[PDB]
Amino acid sequence: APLEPEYPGDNATPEQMHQYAHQLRRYINML
DSSP states (O other): OOOSOOOOTTTOOHHHHHHHHHHHHHHHHHO
């Protein structure tokens, strides 16, 4: 069930943040 991911820490490194936000836009766009 690939839907709404989970934010990486209150403010994770640009790397982890990019991964999460990436999947977010990827999913929303996937559907």
